Amino acid sequence: KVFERCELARTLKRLGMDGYRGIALANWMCLAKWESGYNTRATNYNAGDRSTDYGIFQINSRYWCNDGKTPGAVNACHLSCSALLQDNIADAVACAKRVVRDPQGIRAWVAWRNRCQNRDVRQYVQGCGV
Structure with missing residues (x-):
């Protein structure tokens, strides 16, 4: 699913992301915009390290998550x-x-440093309205 800007903003606020560990909602929005363009099905293979x-x-x-094909991987989010x-971002939020x-x-996300910080x-x- 490709979220519309304000729809995602309201969804993240409802999931408790505003101010989580000192991170303002606008930072999470900036992160999602640059990482996937607000697309939940976005995937990107890193040929360099096989992740x-x-x-x-x-x-x-x-x-963070287990896909079974990534060498020496851990699954800190236990997912x-x-x-x-999924279209429902509850699990994605819990892991973030x-x-x-x-x-x-x-x-932890280099894109945040480059485009948001x-x-x-x-x-x-x-x-x-958030």
Whole structure:
């Protein structure tokens, strides 16, 4: 499913993402926009290390979810990577919350550093009623 901007913003707020571990809602929106364009079925194989990024937040199979084909992988979210490709983003959100519980926080995604950090991210939630 490809979410519309404000629809996703309202959905994430309802799932408790606003201010989670100090991360404002607009940062999660900026992250989803650049990682997948708000698309839950987005997948990206990394030929370099044989891992795959899954879903709206592009969560990696080496550390977070299990896809069975990634070498030396762990499954910290205790989920099949399949769960991160559903239209209902509840599992994806639960796993993204797990990712940021680590010391790096939102910085765990390099795309956040490149396109969101130190920027005016208000635009991502403006007019959405959140």
